[PDB]
Design a protein around this ligand. Structure first.
Ligand code: CLA
Ligand code: CLA
Ligand code: CLA
Ligand code: CLA
Ligand code: CLA
Ligand SMILES: CCCCCCCCCCCCCCCCCC(=O)OC[C@H](CO[C@@H]1O[C@H](CO)[C@H](O)[C@H](O)[C@H]1O)OC(=O)CCCCCCCCCCCCCCCCC
Ligand SMILES: CCCCCCCCCCCCCCCCCC(=O)OC[C@H](CO[C@@H]1O[C@H](CO)[C@H](O)[C@H](O)[C@H]1O)OC(=O)CCCCCCCCCCCCCCCCC
Ligand SMILES: CCCCCCCCCCCCCCCC(=O)OC[C@H](COP(=O)(O)OC[C@@H](O)CO)OC(=O)CCCCCCCCCCCCCCC
Ligand SMILES: CCCCCCCCCCCCCCCC(=O)OC[C@H](COP(=O)(O)OC[C@@H](O)CO)OC(=O)CCCCCCCCCCCCCCC
Ligand SMILES: CC1=C(/C=C/C(C)=C/C=C/C(C)=C/C=C/C=C(C)/C=C/C=C(C)/C=C/C2=C(C)CCCC2(C)C)C(C)(C)CCC1
Ligand SMILES: CC1=C(/C=C/C(C)=C/C=C/C(C)=C/C=C/C=C(C)/C=C/C=C(C)/C=C/C2=C(C)CCCC2(C)C)C(C)(C)CCC1
Ligand SMILES: CCCCCCCS[C@@H]1O[C@H](CO)[C@@H](O)[C@H](O)[C@H]1O
Ligand SMILES: [Ca+2]
Ligand SMILES: [Ca+2]
Ligand SMILES: [Cl-]
Ligand SMILES: [Cl-]
Ligand SMILES: [Fe+2]
Ligand SMILES: [Mg+2]
Lengths: 29, 78, 64, 36, 38, 342, 37, 172, 505, 57, 33
């Protein structure tokens, strides 16, 4: 259960990285 | 631009050097003598190299009593 | 705005917004009470600290 | 205004710093603090 | 009783009052002597 | 231009080389005495009676080993005032009892109050928002937690840090061996805010310097800037594109960027301060209970966590007799933890 | 009831969402070991 | 080691074996990272303090800046006016290029020395050793804070890798 | 729109909804107190105030009820171990219920104030704009605070109309709630004198009544009104947070050092009592007096109260815990059952030997025994090959006086060593480690947890003070500095007085 | 076996670590500075015992 | 230009003890145990 928890939080953070990069608010001039 | 004379004017002027070629060395010599006379040891209560331990004592004069610590140091010094 | 019986009664206690005494008013007297309070805090601090030790005042559980 | 040029004041002052710090390093090897 | 530490307390208090008194006396004096122009 | 208060205010606030202000009345004497007490003690004053150590240039220490050391453990948390019941006005004895320690810590505390009041005062006069004062709360939280709260929760000032380069190194090592302070998540957050702050400092300075507009002919580019110029000196647009493509994300808002540069180190120092408040009570992150239960029952189970406690156990037994002389520890050779050979 | 004129809309932009989720997830990654102990 | 507690293990053993804290290159790295954090907070706070009013009290001031606008978003003259007064005029930058160069250089140079500290203690040129440097008139050792560091280092040394040494010196 | 960290700013101009938000906060806090008490009552074991008192059991609010005179349960027991008592309504359960009902009433009032926010009372009669007269509100509240403070000291604490407060002997053996007379001499300022707490309330209460009347009747100086921005509610937030952090630091300190308001039977002993071997000194005093008057060693140690011996044990020291070692002290070393008795160690020669005690700093500590002069006589070695002082070489034995093991002597070295390891913690106890699946690792008491939370919240409230003080004094530049700001006003020497155009040079 | 003394140190989550204690453990002191790619090992099981992942990483 | 300014005082509070201390520390380099 602890290993599951640590790996789950880690996986959420890698997903978060993917959205923050590829689905960011695009910068607009 | 706050008014005072610029530092670069002061420290390149002959008159600054006339005052300070005497005050700077005087201060330095006074510091020197404060040590060389031994006076520094007595003002601050710092042991001389021969005053950390008695000849055959070999435990440190550690202060162990809050309110009679001053007396302990005086007895330790005895 | 809505009036109520109790709000009518209390109205005078909330009607002087912004009202001031002229100039420095009682500022110097306030300063005296502040200085006395500083001294008071210093005294209770020093007693608890054992920096100020008073006859009949044994700061410990053991006479208390 | 100044009679003594700033580059001389700097050079002499800097040299004075080197001397006094030099002395402090010498002292790490002699007398008190020298381990000897 | 005035214990030796109550006497020390009064000495500390007096010393501080004097450092503060002299500081303000001097600063008030200097500000009076050297006023800003308006 | 009215009463004496307002005439004093005028003079206090003159535009001069060193601004004074009302805050200056607290700041200047306190900063001066803290710094001068430090130079005086490190130059001339021993720690023989409080620690059994030499600590001054006079006794032969160097810039790395001098300190103004804390008072003896028997002093408890005495204010140790010159005129107090311990020194009773004797300056020499007060130096020998560690009076310069509380002198420096307390003037230093009032001095930092005065510096922060100075930040507020100058901000108000110049008409800027007082975020610099706000940022300075992080130094304040660190000073107060480590130099005041920590020893107040312990037995005495003796266990505060002593004011010295090597003395502070000793304080770090003590916190490792006794508190396992590296394991503490509030310290880890401090480390993130410090290293992240240094990271932001470096990367922001390098980015500005490398996205500059050519605003002059010089190959040395510093002259090609004017404080009063309307225009940005570097290209946020190009900087944003570069980092978006290198790292995946980039700042696009300069205001957010600069606020975040305040936020990160200020927040990290505040987190470390909270961990130290816990250490004042020995309320440590010392152990993981599940690790100990496993390792106690399974002599083949080993992690870097169990390796580090063995190091702590070495630090405590080897350092305690000389570091805590009031304890009169005598640890016979046979009881000292040691691995093989060493 | 007459409308309250002190009401204001609230916002959280997408960047703030991402920064906030990162703070929470990383705080959880850091504190979870201590919670399990 | 590639791990959080392994990192601390590496640090503690490194202190036992090289007295890194007493090494001036690690000290320069500390000045680099503490100073980097300090100047990070300083710069953040100075720029933030002098943002030009462009928003109302119900909006984040960050909306006062638009990506790619030409005009600088704060008043550097205001910021310099504050900071030159906080310290003294000539201790403050009014040149943004010089300021930002300093921001880059201070932590980068300090961290280069941190890196060279580790890379030269790699070849066992170690921190200053003042163990028993202070001696009284008879020859008694008068401990300094350096000797107390030594005692903590000895605890690390004797305990680390407790089954790996067979001979009396740890020579790598 | 408003950023997330500013949503509550909608209340600044809305006195009615601010009062509603306050009522709700108050409902939450009273509801917490009520719930916390019920959880404690559902888990508290009242059957042994000697070796299983509230502070061994992670009780946090129970000691606050007890401190002010709530010491009984409706189910018939009392905190001092009585049976068949009738507490009346104001038992622990009655206090919990009162707080839950209060919570409910405050929640309902919050609803009314939220809906009916637009009361004419909150409108400045001259402008029709929302307005609170803060200086006058201060006098009214200060007056009320003074009356309550006074009546608490004059009636509740004296027992004149109320129960009194908890008091005990210097060793926390016989505490109970008692009426307490005010101490009017200098000993009133002694933190360990309960009469000074009574006098404090009477005197400060009178001062608050006077100052309150003053603040009702006299307007602020224009000078002070403008300087502290007294028309801005945020100034009150700033100074109120300052007062609260000061109060929080004070309660952290008196919890950690001990005072008449942080008694050891409610919160546990202090760390300093271990540091100064406070209880060991008293135990030895009593044993030497027993021996002086003809007692055998067995009789002298058998006369030591179990309660006194238990305070002389490091498992009760609040400086032995861990930040993430959660729950009651009982979860670590276990539920204390009985004193084993006092262990006396002797070597083959029969000389009495003393186990060096563990200081609070040390998570682990070696076993070293010295003679009465502090000379080392035995120890438990790490490396064995050069051992000189082992229990086997020195023929160390242990004999017990008092407690479960009174009259017994152990000579088997592993057994003698086992007891020596316990003696580093002070007096030796038998514990039930099974009931709670205790893990053997020390936790702090409510004295430690309280001090931690309050020191930490005090330090954080310093930030909130600095922040709101800044917002107050710099309200005009909250959204940024003047876009037209004169470069003359930040340039050096254009003005004679920093930031003052009338002093142009 | 980081120190080459047949005393293996557990670094991974599934073998009893948490985020704070877990590590990829350095390669074995028996290897020294020798290059230890997967194909130098007799099996993945040997490669794992000797701290092969550390070098690769 | 005035001579004795706040600045002048600031400079000498630091400069004066600094030179005295530096002379004290120079003398120390010749102390033998
Ligand atoms: C703003 C400047 C400032 C501040 C905030 C401090 C603050 C402090 N100093 Mg430092 N000091 C200063 C300037 C300052 N000092 C200067 C200029 C010098 C050179 C003279 C010193 C030299 C110095 C020494 C040598 C020592 C201190 C010490 C102290 C501490 C105890 C002070 C105390 O108890 O006063 C108590 C006094 C007051 C709080 C003044 C109160 C004024 C009230 C409001 C009015 C009451 C006056 C009343 C009418 C007089 C009646 C008295 C009568 C009964 C006899 C405290 C940290 C001690 C310390 O650090 O110990 C470790 C210590 O030994 N200071
Ligand atoms: C990656 C390595 C690393 C990093 C980045 C840090 C980072 C940090 N450490 Mg940790 N540390 C580490 C490894 C590290 N540590 C390890 C391995 C250990 C062993 C356990 C420790 C043990 C340790 C301890 C024991 C403490 C820290 C603390 C801190 C914080 C210090 C903040 C600060 O600037 O205080 C510096 C001080 C201030 C900011 C106070 C105010 C200073 C004023 C402004 C000074 C003014 C000076 C004046 C102008 C004149 C000076 C005169 C001149 C002659 C000198 C910071 C979060 C401290 C902490 O957590 O505090 C809460 C602390 O007590 N560390
Ligand atoms: C002043 C607050 C306070 C204090 C001192 C106590 C004290 C105590 N409680 Mg009570 N309690 C409280 C409030 C408090 N409680 C509240 C608000 C609740 C409702 C949640 C409870 C509900 C409660 C229960 C149900 C129990 C207790 C128990 C206890 C005991 C054990 C405490 C413990 O193990 O702590 C452990 C403390 C920690 C692990 C520290 C937590 C630190 C946090 C997680 C740090 C967060 C960091 C943050 C995320 C960082 C942000 C960074 C960002 C800004 C960038 C102890 C007597 C236990 C007891 O024995 O009961 C009989 C028990 O069973 N309490
Ligand atoms: C009586 C205490 C008190 C009160 C009434 C306020 C009230 C206010 N603060 Mg101040 N503040 C305080 C103490 C207080 N603060 C303290 C101690 C700090 C330092 C920690 C601050 C630091 C602070 C900052 C930095 C800011 C404010 C702001 C504000 C305003 C908007 C708050 C808001 O919308 O948050 C909305 C908050 C949320 C939607 C979620 C917050 C979740 C928190 C972080 C974690 C969970 C909290 C938990 C429920 C706490 C239990 C409380 C108890 C343990 C203390 C409002 C006027 C803001 C402002 O000035 O607006 C102009 C602003 O930027 N405050
Ligand atoms: C870093 C410390 C610090 C800073 C920068 C500020 C800054 C601010 N304060 Mg806050 N304050 C503080 C700590 C601080 N405060 C403390 C510890 C308290 C006591 C609880 C307060 C109580 C307070 C109130 C009640 C108010 C402020 C307000 C203010 C604001 C206006 C300036 C002012 O009033 O200064 C206050 C001046 C000082 C903090 C300096 C005091 C110097 C003391 C008197 C020296 C004493 C020496 C001592 C007696 C020596 C003996 C020592 C002993 C150990 C032996 C500004 C935001 C006001 C505000 O927000 O207006 C909107 C406001 O109403 N302050
Ligand atoms: C001018 C205005 C000054 C305003 C005051 C603030 C100045 C701060 C200076 C603090 C450093 C003083 C060092 C000193 O005097 O060393 C004095 C010591 C004296 O040298 C020692 O003297 C002893 C005499 O008994 C023994 O001989 C020791 O062996 C010997 O090391 O010199 C050194 O340690 C050499 C190097 C000093 C270089 C310090 C680098 C500081 C960098 C960080 C500063 C922050
Ligand atoms: C809405 C809900 C919001 C989220 C709720 C839960 C979120 C998780 C965060 C909770 C923290 C985790 C607690 C530790 C885990 C645990 O099991 O504890 C569990 C403990 C209870 O402990 C249990 O007790 C049991 C018998 O009662 C047994 O002994 C169990 O073994 C024992 O675990 O819970 C508490 O102690 C409650 C809170 C403690 C109060 C601590 C005061 C410290 C405050 C300082 C914080 C300031 C930091 C500021 C930073 C900026
Ligand atoms: C652009 C680069 C800016 C980076 C600056 C680096 C700063 C590092 C700090 C070292 C000193 C700065 C050197 C400036 C480098 C520089 O720009 O050149 C020097 C400048 O030159 P001038 O002769 O024109 O200066 C005299 C002025 O008064 C002009 O009227 O002027 C100075 O002399 C200031 C430095 C020494 C002044 C010391 C005064 C000490 C008094 C006490 C101060 C207490 C302050 C308390 C604050 C709370
Ligand atoms: C030069 C060797 C010293 C090491 C580097 C020192 C500063 C440069 C390294 C920082 C890089 C940061 C990232 C790029 C940041 C960046 O992009 O910088 C750009 C910045 C401005 O660029 P410009 O193109 O205007 O000038 C550089 C060339 O094009 C020549 O004009 O560069 C400089 O100012 C170089 C200054 C060299 C000055 C000579 C050496 C200074 C020695 C100082 C070291 C003291 C040692 C103290 C030890 C206790
Ligand atoms: C404590 C006290 C007090 C006060 C005192 C004072 C205030 C003092 C001051 C003092 C001082 C004020 C001193 C000074 C000193 C200084 C010095 C000693 C310096 C040195 C320097 C050096 C050595 C340099 C170095 C360097 C650097 C830093 C970097 C660059 C390079 C070089 C290396 C050059 C009184 C009386 C109130 C009383 C009580 C006690
Ligand atoms: C309506 C009504 C009623 C009822 C009421 C009730 C039933 C209530 C309840 C209430 C309640 C039952 C409440 C509760 C509350 C609680 C709270 C408010 C809590 C909080 C918590 C917190 C805040 C926490 C925090 C934390 C954590 C979580 C972790 C650690 C850290 C800390 C401590 C920070 C009646 C019938 C009477 C009548 C009238 C109507
Ligand atoms: C240093 C804190 C001083 C607090 C201010 C005390 C107010 S003093 C005030 O000063 C006026 C000037 O307009 C005089 O005309 C008036 O007589 C006097 O009451
Ligand atoms: Ca000789
Ligand atoms: Ca079990
Ligand atoms: Cl190791
Ligand atoms: Cl070997
Ligand atoms: Fe910038
Ligand atoms: Mg020498």
């Amino acid at each position: 259960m602890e290993t599951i928890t640590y790996v789950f939080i880690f996986a959420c953070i890698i997903a978060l990285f993917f959205f923050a990069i590829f689905f960011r608010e695009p910068p607009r001039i | 631009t706050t008014g005072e004379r610029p530092f670069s004017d002061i420290i390149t002027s002959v008159r600054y050097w006339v005052i300070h070629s005497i005050t700077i060395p005087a201060l330095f010599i006074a510091g020197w003598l404060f040590v060389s006379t031994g006076l520094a040891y007595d003002v601050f209560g710092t042991p001389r190299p021969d005053s950390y331990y008695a000849q055959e004592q070999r435990s440190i004069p550690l202060v162990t009593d809050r309110f009679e610590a001053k007396q302990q140091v005086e007895t330790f010094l005895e | 705005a809505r009036r109520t019986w109790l709000g009518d009664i209390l109205r005078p206690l909330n009607s002087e917004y912004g009202k001031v005494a002229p100039g420095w008013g009682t500022t110097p007297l306030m300063a005296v009470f502040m200085g006395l309070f500083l001294v008071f805090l210093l005294i209770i601090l020093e007693i608890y600290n054992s920096t100020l030790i008073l006859d009949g005042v044994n700061v410990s559980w053991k006479a208390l | 205004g100044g009679r003594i040029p700033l580059w001389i004041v700097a050079t002499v002052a800097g040299m004075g710093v080197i001397v006094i710090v030099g002395l402090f390093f010498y002292g790490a090897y002699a007398g008190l603090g020298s381990s000897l | 009783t005035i214990t030796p530490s109550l006497k020390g307390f009064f000495i500390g208090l007096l010393s501080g009052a004097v450092v503060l008194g002299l500081t303000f006396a001097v600063l008030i004096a200097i500000s009076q002597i050297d006023k800003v122009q308006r | 231009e009215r009463g004496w208060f307002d005439i004093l205010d005028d003079w206090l606030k003159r535009d001069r080389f060193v601004f004074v202000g009302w805050s200056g009345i607290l700041l200047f004497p306190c900063a001066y005495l803290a710094l001068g007490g430090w130079l005086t003690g490190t130059t001339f004053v021993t720690s023989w009676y409080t620690h059994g150590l030499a600590s001054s240039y006079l006794e032969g220490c160097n810039f790395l080993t001098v300190a103004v050391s804390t008072p003896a453990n028997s002093m408890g948390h005495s204010l140790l005032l010159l005129w107090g019941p311990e020194a009773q006005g004797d300056f020499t004895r007060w130096c020998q009892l560690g009076g310069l320690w509380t002198f420096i810590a307390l003037h230093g505390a009032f001095g930092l109050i005065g510096f922060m009041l100075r930040q507020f005062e100058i901000a108000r006069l110049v008409g800027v928002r007082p975020y610099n004062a706000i940022a300075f709360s992080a130094p304040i939280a660190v000073f107060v937690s480590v130099f005041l709260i920590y020893p107040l929760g312990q037995s005495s000032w003796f266990f505060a840090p002593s004011f010295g380069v090597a003395a502070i190194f000793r304080f770090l090592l003590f916190f490792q061996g006794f508190h396992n302070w590296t394991l503490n998540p509030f310290h880890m957050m401090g480390v993130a805010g410090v290293l992240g702050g240094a990271l932001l400092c470096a990367i922001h300075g390098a980015t500005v310097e490398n996205t500059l507009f050519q605003d002059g002919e010089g190959a040395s580019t510093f002259r090609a800037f004017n404080p009063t110029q309307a225009e940005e000196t570097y290209s946020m647009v190009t900087a944003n594109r570069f980092w978006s493509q290198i790292f995946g994300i980039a700042f696009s808002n300069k205001r957010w960027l600069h606020f975040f540069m305040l936020f990160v180190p200020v927040t990290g120092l505040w987190m470390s301060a909270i961990g130290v408040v816990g250490l004042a009570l020995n309320l440590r992150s010392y152990d993981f209970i599940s690790q100990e239960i496993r390792a106690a029952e399974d002599p083949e189970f080993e992690t870097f966590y169990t390796k580090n406690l063995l190091l702590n156990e070495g630090i405590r037994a080897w350092m305690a007799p000389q570091d805590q002389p009031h304890e009169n520890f005598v640890f016979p050779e046979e009881v000292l933890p040691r691995g093989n050979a060493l | 009831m007459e409308p309250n004129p002190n009401r204001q809309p609230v916002e959280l932009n997408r960047t703030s969402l991402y920064l906030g989720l990162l703070l929470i997830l990383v705080l959880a990654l850091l504190f979870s070991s201590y919670f399990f102990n | 080691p590639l791990g959080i507690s392994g990192t601390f293990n590496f640090m503690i053993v490194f202190q036992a074996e090289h007295n890194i804290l007493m090494h001036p290159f690690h000290q320069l790295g500390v000045a680099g990272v503490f100073g980097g954090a300090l100047f990070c907070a300083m710069h953040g706070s100075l720029v933030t303090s002098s943002l030009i009013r462009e928003t109302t009290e119900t909006e984040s001031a960050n909306y006062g800046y638009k990506f790619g606008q030409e005009e600088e978003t704060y008043n550097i003259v205001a910021a310099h006016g504050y900071f030159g007064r906080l310290i003294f005029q000539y201790a403050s930058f009014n040149n943004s290029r010089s300021l930002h160069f300093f921001l880059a250089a201070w932590p980068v140079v300090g961290v280069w020395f941190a890196a060279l500290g580790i890379s030269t203690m790699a070849f066992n040129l170690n921190g200053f050793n003042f163990n028993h440097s202070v001696i009284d008139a008879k020859g008694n050792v008068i401990n300094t804070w350096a000797d107390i560091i030594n005692r903590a280092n000895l605890g690390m040394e004797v305990m680390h890798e407790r089954n790996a040494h067979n001979f009396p010196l740890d020579l790598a | 729109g408003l950023p997330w960290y500013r949503v509550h700013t909608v209340l600044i101009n809305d006195p009615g909804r601010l009062i509603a938000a306050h009522l709700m906060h108050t409902a939450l806090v009273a509801g917490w107190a009520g719930s916390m008490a019920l959880y404690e009552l559902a888990t508290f074991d009242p059957s042994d105030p000697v070796l299983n008192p509230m502070w061994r059991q992670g009780m946090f609010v129970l000691p606050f009820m007890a401190r002010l005179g709530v010491t009984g349960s409706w189910s018939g027991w009392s905190i001092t171990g009585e049976t068949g008592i009738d507490p009346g309504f104001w038992s622990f359960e009655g206090v919990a219920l009162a707080h839950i009902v209060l919570s409910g009433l405050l929640f309902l009032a919050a609803c009314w104030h939220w809906v009916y926010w637009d009361l004419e009372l909150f409108r400045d009669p001259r402008t029709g704009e929302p307005a609170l007269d803060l200086p006058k509100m201060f006098g009214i509240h200060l007056f009320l605070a003074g009356l309550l403070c006074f009546g608490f000291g004059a009636f509740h604490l004296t027992g004149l109309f109320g129960p009194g407060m908890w008091v005990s002997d210097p060793y926390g053996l016989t505490g109970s709630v008692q009426p307490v007379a005010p101490e009017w001499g200098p000993d009133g300022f002694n933190p360990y004198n309960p009469g000074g707490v009574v006098a404090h309330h009477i005197a400060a209460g009178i001062v608050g009544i006077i100052a309150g009347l003053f603040h009702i009747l006299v307007r602020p100086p224009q000078r002070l009104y403008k300087a502290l921005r007294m028309g801005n509610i945020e100034t009150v937030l700033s100074s109120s947070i300052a007062a609260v952090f000061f109060a929080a630091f004070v309660v952290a300190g008196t919890m950690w050092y001990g005072s008449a308001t942080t008694p050891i039977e409610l919160f546990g002993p202090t760390r300093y009592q271990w540091d100064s071997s406070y209880f060991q000194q008293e135990i030895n005093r009593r044993v030497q007096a027993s021996l002086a008057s003809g007692a055998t060693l067995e009789e002298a140690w058998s006369a030591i109260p179990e309660k006194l011996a238990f305070y002389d044990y490091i498992g009760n020291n609040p400086a032995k815990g861990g930040l993430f070692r959660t729950g009651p002290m009982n979860k670590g070393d276990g539920i204390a059952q009985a004193w084993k008795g006092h262990a006396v160690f002797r070597n083959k020669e029969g000389e009495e030997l003393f186990v060096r005690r563990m200081p609070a700093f040390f998570e682990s500590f070696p076993v070293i025994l010295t003679d009465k002069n502090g000379v080392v006589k035995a120890d438990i070695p790490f490396r064995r090959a050069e051992s000189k002082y082992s229990f086997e070489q020195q023929g160390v034995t242990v004999s017990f006086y008092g407690g479960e093991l009174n009259g017994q002597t152990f000579t088997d070295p592993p057994t003698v060593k086992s007891y020596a390891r316990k003696a580093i913690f002070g007096e030796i106890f038998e514990f039930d480690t099974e009931t709670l699946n205790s893990d053997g690792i020390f936790r702090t008491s409510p004295r430690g947890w309280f001090t931690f939370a309050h020191a930490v919240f005090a330090l954080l409230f310093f930030f909130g003070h600095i922040w709101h003080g800044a917002r107050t004094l710099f309200r005009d530049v909250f959204s940024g500095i003047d876009p037209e700001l004169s470069p003359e006003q930040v340039e050096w020497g254009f003005y004679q007085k920093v930031g003052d155009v009338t002093t142009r040079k | 076996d980081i120190d080459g003394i047949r005393e293996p140190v557990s670094g991974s989550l599934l073998y009893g670590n948490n985020i704070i204690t877990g590590a990829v453990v350095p390669s074995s002191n028996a290897i020294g500075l020798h290059f230890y790619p997967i194909w130098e090992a007799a099996s993945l099981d040997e490669w794992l015992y000797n701290g092969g992942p550390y070098q690769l990483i | 230009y005035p001579i004795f300014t706040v600045r002048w005082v600031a400079v000498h509070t630091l400069a004066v003890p600094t030179i005295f201390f530096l002379g004290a520390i120079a003398a120390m380099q010749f102390i033998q145990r």
